[PDB]
C-alpha cells in the first residue's frame, strides 16, 4: 500500500490498484507490471513485500505523484508567465485548447452562478 | 541594529550560469542559483546570449535546421 508515498488500495487487481498513482493510468499500469514482471489478476493483498519493493524501484522510472504535480504546475506557470495567448487563457479560466465559449465552456468557467 | 525583528542576513552563494560565484549576504538562506550577473549580461557585455543564460541549445538541436 505504501508505494509512491501513497496508500494504493487492496483487494483489487494489481493492474487496477496500480492506477491509483498519479502518473500511471492503464497503459503504464500494464507497462510497469510487465517491466517488473508481475501477473495481472493478482490482487494487492496477493502481493508480497518483495514484489512491493520491486514496484517501488520500478515505477520510479516513470515520474509520478507529487513530482508530476509540480511539473504540470510549473508548465502552466511558464505559460502564464511568458505572456503568451495560452497564459491569458489560463489566467481567465477559459478553454485553452481552442474550444467555443459563447456556450459550453463549463468545465473551465464553472457552473452557472450568474 | 535591533534584535528579534530583523530578517536573517546569512552569507549565501551567488552562482549564475555566467559561472561566476559571488559570496553575498541576503535573506535568501539557501544556495542561490541565478541566470545573469554584472558579467555575462547583454547590456554590460557584447555577446548576445553571452554564454549559457539559458540552455536552450536544447530544442534547437531537436529541429536542427540551419
Amino acid at each position: 500500500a505504501r508505494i509512491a508515498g501513497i496508500n494504493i488500495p487492496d483487494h483489487k487487481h494489481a493492474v487496477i490498484a496500480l492506477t491509483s498513482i498519479y502518473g500511471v493510468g492503464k497503459t503504464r499500469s500494464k507497462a510497469i507490471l510487465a517491466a517488473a514482471g508481475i501477473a495481472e489478476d493478482v490482487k494487492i493483498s496477493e502481493l508480497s513485500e518483495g514484489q512491493i519493493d520491486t514496484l517501488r524501484d520500478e515505477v520510479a522510472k516513470f515520474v509520478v505523484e507529487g513530482d508530476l504535480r509540480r511539473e504540470i504546475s510549473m508548465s502552466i506557470k511558464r505559460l502564464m508567465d511568458l505572456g503568451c495567448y495560452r497564459g491569458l487563457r489560463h489566467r481567465r479560466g477559459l478553454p485553452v485548447r481552442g474550444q467555443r465559449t459563447k456556450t459550453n465552456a463549463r468545465t473551465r468557467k464553472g457552473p452557472r452562478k450568474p | 541594529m535591533k534584535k528579534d525583528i530583523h530578517p536573517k542576513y546569512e552569507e549565501i552563494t551567488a552562482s549564475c550560469s555566467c559561472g561566476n560565484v559571488m559570496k553575498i549576504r541576503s535573506t535568501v538562506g539557501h544556495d542561490l542559483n541565478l541566470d545573469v550577473c554584472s558579467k555575462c549580461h547583454p547590456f554590460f557585455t557584447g555577446k548576445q546570449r553571452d554564454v549559457a543564460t539559458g540552455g536552450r541549445v536544447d530544442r534547437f538541436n531537436k529541429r536542427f535546421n540551419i
Partner: protein, 82 residues
C-alpha cells in the same frame, strides 16, 4: 502542430530583416505582419512589432520565448467583461 520532418517556419522577409537587425539593431522596430513565423533562438534580444489586426503590439523575444509563434504573444480581441 507543425511536422518535424518539415522543420520550423519563418517568413523569408522576417528572417532576413532579423539578420540585418541582429547585426545592426538597437530595437529599431521591426514590424512584422507575420504572426505565424516561429521564434528562432537568434531573435533573442529582439522586441519585434507584430501585428494583431490593427496595431503592432510589441513582443520582447526572450529565452523561454523560443518554441512558439509570433502570433502567440499578440492577442487579437479586446475583451473586458459584461
Amino acid at each position: 502542430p507543425r511536422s518535424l520532418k518539415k522543420g520550423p517556419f519563418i517568413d523569408l522577409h522576417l528572417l532576413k530583416k532579423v539578420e540585418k537587425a541582429v547585426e545592426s539593431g538597437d530595437k529599431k522596430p521591426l514590424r512584422t505582419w507575420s504572426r505565424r513565423s516561429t521564434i528562432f533562438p537568434n531573435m533573442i534580444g529582439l522586441t519585434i512589432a507584430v501585428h494583431n489586426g490593427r496595431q503592432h503590439v510589441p513582443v520582447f523575444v526572450t529565452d523561454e520565448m523560443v518554441g512558439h509563434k509570433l502570433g502567440e504573444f499578440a492577442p487579437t480581441r479586446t475583451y473586458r467583461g459584461h
